[PDB]
Each structure stands twice: as structure tokens, then as C-alpha cells.
Design a protein around this ligand. Structure first.
Ligand SMILES: *[C@@H]1O[C@H](CO)[C@@H](O)[C@H](O)[C@H]1NC(C)=O
Ligand SMILES: *[C@@H]1O[C@H](CO)[C@@H](O)[C@H](O)[C@H]1NC(C)=O
Ligand SMILES: *[C@@H]1O[C@H](CO)[C@@H](O)[C@H](O)[C@H]1NC(C)=O
Ligand SMILES: *[C@@H]1O[C@H](CO)[C@@H](O)[C@H](O)[C@H]1NC(C)=O
Ligand SMILES: *[C@@H]1O[C@H](CO)[C@@H](O)[C@H](O)[C@H]1NC(C)=O
Ligand SMILES: *[C@@H]1O[C@H](CO)[C@@H](O)[C@H](O)[C@H]1NC(C)=O
Ligand SMILES: *[C@@H]1O[C@H](CO)[C@@H](O)[C@H](O)[C@H]1NC(C)=O
Lengths: 50, 330, 216, 99, 49, 39, 50, 49, 49
């Protein structure tokens, strides 16, 4: 709706900082997974003898 | 978007793409009759306020711009709608109530009012939608000897319900001795007459009041104004106007099991998912047109001005309506 | 002639057994739990089983009506504050072949309406309501085995008619060998369940017990 | 046994479901549908009702994002604990009691 | 005649819920931990005391 | 924490099934099944 | 007040999610106390010699 | 809506009302018989299932 | 020495005291008392306040 968008433009930059907070959360989740699991520099494998 | 003249290396959410609508369609029921507002507004005699008339209006095309030529009133005072938008959208039934009051009591013809007319003669509901039209009738309802043909009720045992009529003539019991049909001490007639004279003030002059009450869409529509219809188009992003319900989307054939009394289907977020076409009795599913987010992948502007575009959550065959290297990720 | 012919009425009391549910609106909804505040017959309530082999019957906030007999007895219901002529009253008389809803507002006629669909080992459940000067009638026809007492299950009631009468409906009386269940509606909140096809298959009365209040 | 990850899934489902269900609210306006407001009224009155709906939906969105920020802080603390346990339990032998 | 702030908090819709474990149970847990630490050392934290 | 209607207090002590208040829990047991309250 | 309740019913599910947040805090406090103090499995006691 | 009891509040002769911290009427003077009456909200609480 | 637990008590007291004291504010209306608003005005204006 164009009228609602033109009225929402008068409320400032709430949407931009809302998007910034969500983007920071999204980057932080991948950082959490990478700092938990990616702790080894080389991909070792088990020898075929068991 | 970044409000800067240089961009660092990364991926940035810029905007959203949206498939624009192509055509506009209007789907109204096929009705050729004309609504008789002239028989309501133009009348020689108007009813009293305790015995107010009620006229049902259905199965006709209503033009609300011809009301202004019927009676000499200032404003089209409405509550749930606007007077300039009455010709576009449309209703189920219209009810016209006509009566004669004085100039003091015009403010009591309103939702949530307390007085004499509102409590004992004519009560409007709290959720009333419609319009009230009042105009001066000093030259028609008044005589220099005193017009006594208009009555009002001020003695009752309880307040009236909304849209409730009371035409009974029994002697009011204001004391302890029974009246037995004879007036006297603590026994008064509930109806008293107005005293309209043309030498009276403007606040005591007679006023004719017509209240138009609209029934919003729950049933198939019977009263719809002058808008021409359009051929129905399916499987395309179009603007649609179904009985005054406007929207944008794609209309598809449906297999929803609509009951014969059901005309609409709603969602969890209170939006219309399915519509019943008024001309041909068919069920149409409405879906929003294709959209999604656009991200711009770039190196630094001191490195290159080349960019890549990621369309999020949409397949690679639906994005239009280097850059020849189309790749499909998750 | 007018006569009297007071067919003797004996009151018997039975239990509602979660009956008397109608569609609150004309909006299609599928696979949704929906909370509605309206006039409903309460669950496990006290309904009256009148036998007819007739002073008055009070009317308040709507009436649920149930009939089992197929012997072609129950015709209509007279509504109003008085009986013949003191105030406004209502008359919804009906016959067999061409089903009339011939409704009157003489006592000076101000409302006339004739329509077909009102009436068609089988329950014919009706709900009559009066709100804001509007009179609403819902109904549903269902089968039964073991016709004694009301059944156990769910059968939603579909709407029939809405009229702008605007009168006082304090009293009512059935026009007549016959037996019928009468129950009284109260302002209550239900939680209705709409399945995949859009039909009401289950409901919860939020003011029956603390468990259903927890469910609501 | 796996109730913590199930709660992690359930909270993110419930927050989005509440955010969708908050679109049916009127917030003091005459309707919750924006097109019905834009069709029923003229420009000024529809601007008033649209402003009411805008304020209500903005408040709901801000509440959702604040709860998401608090939950993200809790999840980051748990991820720091998990990374410390991977560094000290799997990659070596720990003398800390009940670690 | 001396109105308390807790009465206004209760009358205006704010209530305080009691904890699940009383102070006697926390004291019993503390006493059990102390008795185990004194009479067994660090063994009771790894299995049988 | 107030009072309890519909649960029968017992002079036993089990693990907490449903927490209520200051040291009081409730459970549902077979020994005719019923809801009981305990510490 | 009945009028205030009827106008408050049009504001959505703010009260339910505030109640949910407060209930989560209240359960979390008892969880904190249980995870701090209830670390022993048996209630040991000191012998009467001191 | 509430419960009215006899009060021992020392109202001055020019005072006809009494308020709380949350700006609610706590005491009142009856306009016919010059008597101080408290105002207490009726019984309430929470219900858990 | 025990200022942390006293701060824990004091913050929870101060939040509830501020929540009680916030009920006396008008927020742009004509009165902070709800019954006076309902008594003074008709339906639409009292609905606005
Ligand atoms: C009102 O209606 C009557 C009946 O047709 C008609 O004769 C009369 O001219 C109308 N009034 C006006 C002002 O046209
Ligand atoms: C309106 O259209 C429908 C289907 O197109 C048709 O069956 C019906 O007869 C039409 N009505 C009139 C009055 O032309
Ligand atoms: C979406 O893309 C996949 C692979 O790119 C393709 O197999 C599928 O048919 C596409 N869906 C369409 C075109 O609707
Ligand atoms: C219905 O009311 C009658 C009145 O005496 C009572 O005897 C009967 O038990 C009631 N039915 C119930 C509670 O199911
Ligand atoms: C009917 O009249 C009675 C008084 O005899 C009144 O108390 C009641 O409210 C009226 N009902 C309606 C629906 O107006
Ligand atoms: C919906 O209707 C179809 C056809 O009548 C039926 O096969 C299906 O079981 C129904 N769904 C239900 C009862 O959930
Ligand atoms: C009002 O009532 C009080 C108590 O009975 C009495 O003292 C006073 O004189 C009365 N006022 C008048 C004007 O009669």
C-alpha cells in the first residue's frame, strides 16, 4: 500500500535499525557455529583398520 | 542504502523485488433496478418520532450523488463510512428511517447518546454504521396557529433497545393509585405534542431526519452502486475488486468446500484467502504475487565496480518479468 | 372455533449432552481453532422435555429447540410480550407442502416476509436469537438411532434467516402426541475447531470446568 | 533427553506465529484490514486509522526484535560454554570437578 | 491507618510468588555438602563417599 | 502459596513432579487413581 | 472496568506474552537455585563426635 | 466498587477526600452524616490449575 | 559486605514501586482516574481518553 508507506516514511529510521539488529543476530549465529565446531585445521580420517 | 560513497567488501541487503500487477478487474453482481431514494426523501407527510417508518432497500443500484438534489441539507453526516466513497463499495441491505424532531434533539441522533429521543423514542446502536441527514422543515411542518400532528414519548418504564419501536398508548403509572385509563394526579399520557410555530427560534423549529443504515457484507450483496464489471482473468498478477473488496494478487481456481451460505474465506492474519465470484458462483483462491529480497555481493569500490545479485528464496526461472552466469543455490 | 383444547403438558428434565452449536459467521475457515464470544447453549445444561398428549414459555437471550417426532405436529412459534392484541407480537406459522415463513407484525402491519426454506428418527434442531432488533434463526437436520435422550456427538447448525423486526420478545409459545426439548442460551465463549474441509467437528466451553478454561 | 534443542525450535516458531497473529488486531481503529480502511473512508480519516495501525504493528515488531536480542545473548553464552567444553574436554584431559 | 506499599502493590495487580525451595531445605543442602566435605574429602563429588 | 482444592495431602515424601509453592509438590498416583499433594 | 477491558481486547496478545515472559523468569529463578544448591545426591550428616 | 468500613483517619474539617500513591480514593466523607469511611477493593486473587 | 544481595532486594522493590507510582500519570488525558473519565464524558470522548 503506497499510502501506508508514505505515512511510514514519517516515523524515521526504526526499520533500518530493526534490520541492523536482525542482521547482527544472523551473523552472530554463524559465528557461534564456526567458533564451536571449526577448531581443527586439518580434516583427519580414520585408518581402514578398525 | 548504506548512505555512503564507498562500499566495503561483503554482502548487503538492499531492497525487495515485486511483480507489478498488469490488469485491473471489477466483479459486481448484475443488477439493473434503481433504488427509490426519491420516495423516501420527497414525501408530503413524515412520520412521528415514536412511530418512525422503516423502509427496506434491496436489489437495486444506488446512486448516492442524487440525494443532494432531493432535500436542502447542509452536510451528509456519516459515521462508519464517508459520503464520497459510498458509490464505490457496496452493502447487503439499506434501511431508511424518516421522522420529525425539533432542532434541540438533532444532536441525540448519534451512537451512544442519552436524552429523551435516544432513550424513549429512537435509539441508535453503539456500533452503528451509516449516515444521518437532517434538514429544516419550518415551511412545511409548521403553521401560525400551531401544528399538533407530531408526537413524542417521554414517559416509559425502561430505556429503548437499539432499533426498537414502541407505539403503545397506555397511561403511565407515576405514583401508587392505578390510572385505569383515566388521567389525573400521578397519571399522565406518555405522548405529548409538539408546538411548531414559524415565529419560534431556529432551535425550536421542526427538522426532518432520515437515517440510512447499511448492512456490511455477510450475505451476497443486493445494493451496489454504478460501477461497470470486467471479464474475469486468472493465473495473472492483477488488481481485483470483488463487491468493494479491493486487492492485488493472482486468482486461481479452487477446490475449497465452501458451504452455500459462505461467501468469504479468511486467514490466520485476518486476510482474504478465497473469494466467491458474484456473477458466476465460483470459488477463487487469491495469492500474493512473486516477491523476495535482493542482496548485492561486491568487493571494495577501490577494487572493482562489479557486483553480483542474489535473489533470496526464489527460483532461477522466475526472477525477470557479467550476469549471464545464473547459478542456483539453496 | 377458538375453543380451548388445552393439551396437557407434563415437564420432564434431561441433560443437554454437548449439543447446540452453530456457525457464528459466514466466513470459511479450515484447520483453525477459533475463539468466539456469542449466545450459546451451555454444555451439560438443564433442558426441559415437554410432553403433549399451555400457560406460556419465557424467552430470554434466545432459545434452542429440538424435535424428534415425524408425526407432523409442530408448526410454528408465536413470539411477543402479549398474546392477541396489546403490544407488538410475532407469528411464524407454517404448513406442510409449500413451507412458508409467513411472518407478521400486525399487532397495523409493519413487517411481512414469505420464503421457502424453513423445514426440510430425526432431530430438527433450531436456534432463535434476538439482538439489536434483529431476529436470527439457525437450524440443522440430523439422524438418530436409539431416540431416547439427546445424542452424544457434534453437529453444527447452519443459518436460515435474519429479519429486521425490532420488537420485544419476552414471551413465546409453540403452536401444536408431541414432545420437544427446550433449552436457553447464555452469553458464553467457545473454542471451535475447523477441520480440513471447513466443518466444525469439536468445541470447548470455556466456562464449564477449570480444565476447559485451561484449554481455552 | 533432547528438550533443550526442541525448546530452541519451539521458541522461534512461537515468536513468528505471534508476530503473524498480531496482524489481526485493530489497535483502536475501525478495522484490521488496510484496504477496507482505505476504501471506506476519505483521505484524512483513513490517514488517522492507518497511523493507528502503523503504531500498533511497529510496537509489535519492536517487541519481537527485543526478545530476539535477549535470546541471542543467551544462545551466545551457551555457544561460548560449548566451545570451551570442546577445547577442554575433547582436545585434552580436564582436572576440573564436574566439568 | 498506616498503609503499606505492599497493600497498594497487591491492590493494583502486582503479586510476588513464593520460591519452590524454602530456607530450611537450602540449609539442609548446605549441611549435607558441609558434612560430606568434612567427613569424606573430594570423593563424595566423584561417586560414593 | 495459597491453598489447594481437589488434592489429598499425604504424610510421605517423593521427588517433585508438579511444583506448587514453598516445598509443596503434587502428583497423580494409582494408590483408585487420584491427585495427591506432598512435601 | 468493563469498558476498559473491551477496549483493551482490541490490542492483541501483549498481555499473554508479558505473562509468558514473567512466568519464564519465575521458573528460571527456581532452576538457578536448584542447579546451585542441589548438587549432592544424598543427605550426609556429621557423626556425633566432633 | 468496594467495601466501606468505619475509619479512624484524622480528617481535617476542610478535607473531604483521601488518596493513595497511585492516585486512587482511599477514604471518603459521607455528605449526609459527617463520617469518614474507608474504601477497600473486594476479594480477589489468582487461580492456577 | 553483603551489598550485592541487598541490591538484589532493592532493585526488585524499586521496580514495583515505580510501577505503582506510574498509575498516577495522565499521559495526555484529562484525568488519571478511570472512573472520573467514564463519569464526565459520553462514549466516544471517554473511549479516546
Ligand atoms: C415528490 O413526488 C411526487 C410524486 O411523484 C411528485 O409529484 C413531486 O413533484 C415530487 N416533488 C418534487 C419536489 O419533485
Ligand atoms: C447474471 O449473470 C448470471 C451468470 O452470468 C446469469 O445466470 C443471470 O441470469 C444474470 N442475471 C440477470 C438479471 O441478467
Ligand atoms: C526450481 O529449480 C529447480 C532446479 O533449479 C527445478 O528442478 C524446478 O523445476 C524449479 N521449479 C519450477 C521451475 O517451478
Ligand atoms: C434440572 O433441574 C431440576 C430441578 O429440580 C433438577 O431436579 C435436576 O436434577 C436438574 N438436572 C440436572 C442438574 O442435570
Ligand atoms: C421488554 O420490556 C421489558 C419491560 O416490560 C424490559 O425490561 C425489557 O428490557 C424489554 N426487552 C427488550 C429486548 O427491549
Ligand atoms: C473431507 O471430505 C472428503 C470427501 O467428502 C473426505 O474424503 C475427507 O475424509 C474429509 N476430511 C475430513 C473428514 O477430515
Ligand atoms: C441532612 O441530614 C442530616 C442527617 O440526618 C441532618 O443533620 C441535616 O440537617 C440534613 N440537612 C437538611 C438540609 O435537612
Amino acid at each position: 500500500s503506497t499510502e501506508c508507506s508514505n505515512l511510514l516514511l514519517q516515523y524515521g529510521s526504526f526499520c533500518t535499525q530493526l534490520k541492523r539488529a536482525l542482521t547482527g543476530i544472523a551473523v552472530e549465529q554463524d559465528k557461534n557455529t564456526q567458533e564451536v565446531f571449526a577448531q581443527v585445521k586439518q580434516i583427519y580420517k580414520t585408518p581402514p583398520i578398525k | 542504502t548504506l548512505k555512503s560513497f564507498t562500499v566495503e567488501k561483503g554482502i548487503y541487503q538492499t531492497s525487495n523485488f515485486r511483480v507489478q500487477p498488469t490488469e485491473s478487474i471489477v466483479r459486481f453482481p448484475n443488477i439493473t433496478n434503481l433504488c427509490p431514494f426519491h420516495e423516501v426523501f420527497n414525501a408530503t407527510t413524515f412520520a412521528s418520532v415514536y412511530a418512525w417508518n422503516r423502509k427496506r432497500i434491496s436489489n437495486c443500484v444506488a446512486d448516492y450523488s442524487v440525494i443532494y438534489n432531493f432535500a436542502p441539507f447542509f452536510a451528509f453526516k456519516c459515521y462508519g463510512v464517508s459520503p464520497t466513497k459510498l458509490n464505490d463499495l457496496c452493502f447487503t441491505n439499506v434501511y431508511a428511517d424518516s421522522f420529525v424532531i425539533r432542532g434541540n434533539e438533532v444532536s441525540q441522533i448519534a451512537p451512544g447518546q442519552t436524552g429523551n429521543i435516544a432513550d424513549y423514542n429512537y435509539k441508535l446502536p453503539d456500533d452503528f454504521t451509516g449516515c444521518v441527514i437532517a434538514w429544516n422543515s419550518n415551511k412545511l411542518d409548521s403553521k401560525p396557529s400551531g401544528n399538533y400532528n407530531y408526537l413524542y414519548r417521554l414517559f416509559r418504564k425502561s430505556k429503548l433497545k437499539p432499533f426498537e419501536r414502541d407505539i403503545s398508548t397506555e397511561i403511565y403509572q407515576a405514583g401508587n393509585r392505578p390510572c385505569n385509563g383515566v388521567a389525573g394526579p400521578n397519571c399522565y399520557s406518555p405522548l405529548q405534542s409538539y408546538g411548531f410555530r414559524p415565529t419560534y427560534g431556529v432551535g425550536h423549529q421542526p427538522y426532518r431526519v432520515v437515517v440510512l443504515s447499511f448492512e456490511l457484507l455477510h450475505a451476497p450483496a443486493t445494493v451496489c452502486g454504478p460501477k461497470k464489471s470486467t471479464n474475469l482473468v486468472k493465473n495473472k498478477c492483477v488488481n481485483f475488486n470483488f463487491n468493494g473488496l479491493t486487492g492485488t494478487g493472482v486468482l486461481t481456481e479452487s477446490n475449497k468446500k465452501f458451504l452455500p451460505f459462505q461467501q468469504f474465506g479468511r486467514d490466520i492474519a485476518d486476510t482474504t484467502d478465497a473469494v466467491r465470484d458474484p456473477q458466476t458462483l465460483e470459488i477463487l483462491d487469491i495469492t500474493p504475487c512473486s516477491f523476495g529480497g535482493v542482496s548485492v555481493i561486491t568487493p571494495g569500490t577501490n577494487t572493482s565496480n562489479q557486483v553480483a545479485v542474489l535473489y533470496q528464496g526464489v527460483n532461477c526461472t522466475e526472477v525477470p518479468v557479467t550476469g549471464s552466469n545464473v547459478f542456483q543455490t539453496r | 372455533s377458538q375453543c380451548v383444547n388445552l393439551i396437557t403438558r407434563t415437564q420432564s428434565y434431561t441433560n443437554s449432552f454437548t449439543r447446540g452449536v452453530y456457525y457464528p459467521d459466514k466466513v470459511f475457515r479450515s484447520s483453525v481453532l477459533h475463539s468466539t464470544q456469542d449466545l450459546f447453549l451451555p454444555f451439560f445444561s438443564n433442558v426441559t422435555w415437554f410432553h403433549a398428549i399451555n400457560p406460556a414459555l419465557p424467552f430470554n437471550d434466545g432459545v434452542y429447540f429440538a424435535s424428534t417426532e415425524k408425526s407432523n405436529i409442530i408448526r410454528g412459534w408465536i413470539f411477543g410480550t402479549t398474546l392477541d392484541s396489546k403490544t407488538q407480537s410475532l407469528l411464524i406459522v407454517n404448513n406442510a407442502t409449500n413451507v412458508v415463513i409467513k411472518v407478521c407484525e400486525f399487532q397495523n402491519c409493519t413487517f411481512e416476509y414469505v420464503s421457502q426454506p424453513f423445514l426440510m428418527k430425526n432431530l430438527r434442531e433450531f436456534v432463535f436469537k434476538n439482538i439489536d432488533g434483529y431476529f436470527k434463526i439457525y437450524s440443522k437436520h440430523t439422524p438418530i438411532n436409539l431416540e431416547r435422550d439427546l445424542p452424544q456427538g457434534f453437529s453444527a447448525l447452519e443459518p436460515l434467516v435474519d429479519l429486521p423486526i425490532g420488537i420485544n420478545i419476552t414471551r413465546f409459545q409453540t403452536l401444536l402426541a408431541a414432545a420437544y426439548y427446550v433449552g436457553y442460551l447464555q452469553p458464553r465463549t467457545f473454542l471451535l475447531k475447523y477441520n480440513e474441509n471447513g466443518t466444525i467437528t469439536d468445541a470447548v466451553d470455556c466456562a464449564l470446568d477449570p480444565l476447559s478454561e485451561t484449554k481455552c | 533427553a533432547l528438550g533443550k534443542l526442541q525448546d530452541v525450535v519451539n521458541h522461534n516458531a512461537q515468536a513468528l506465529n505471534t508476530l503473524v497473529k498480531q496482524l489481526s488486531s485493530k489497535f483502536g481503529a475501525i478495522s484490521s484490514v488496510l484496504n477496507d480502511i482505505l476504501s471506506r473512508l476519505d483521505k484524512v480519516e483513513a490517514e488517522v486509522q492507518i497511523d493507528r495501525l502503523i503504531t500498533g504493528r511497529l510496537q509489535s515488531l519492536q517487541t519481537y526484535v527485543t526478545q530476539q536480542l535477549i535470546r541471542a545473548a543467551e544462545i551466545r553464552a551457551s555457544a561460548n560454554l560449548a566451545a570451551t567444553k570442546m577445547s577442554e574436554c575433547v582436545l585434552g584431559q580436564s582436572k576440573r570437578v564436574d566439568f | 491507618a498506616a498503609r503499606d506499599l505492599i497493600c497498594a502493590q497487591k491492590f493494583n495487580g502486582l503479586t510476588v510468588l513464593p520460591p519452590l525451595l524454602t530456607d530450611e531445605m537450602i540449609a539442609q543442602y548446605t549441611s549435607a555438602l558441609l558434612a560430606g566435605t568434612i567427613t569424606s574429602g573430594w570423593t563424595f563429588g566423584a561417586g560414593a563417599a | 502459596a495459597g491453598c489447594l482444592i481437589g488434592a489429598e495431602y499425604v504424610n510421605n515424601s517423593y521427588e517433585c513432579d508438579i511444583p506448587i509453592g514453598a516445598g509443596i509438590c503434587a502428583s497423580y498416583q494409582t494408590q483408585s487413581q487420584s491427585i495427591i499433594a506432598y512435601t
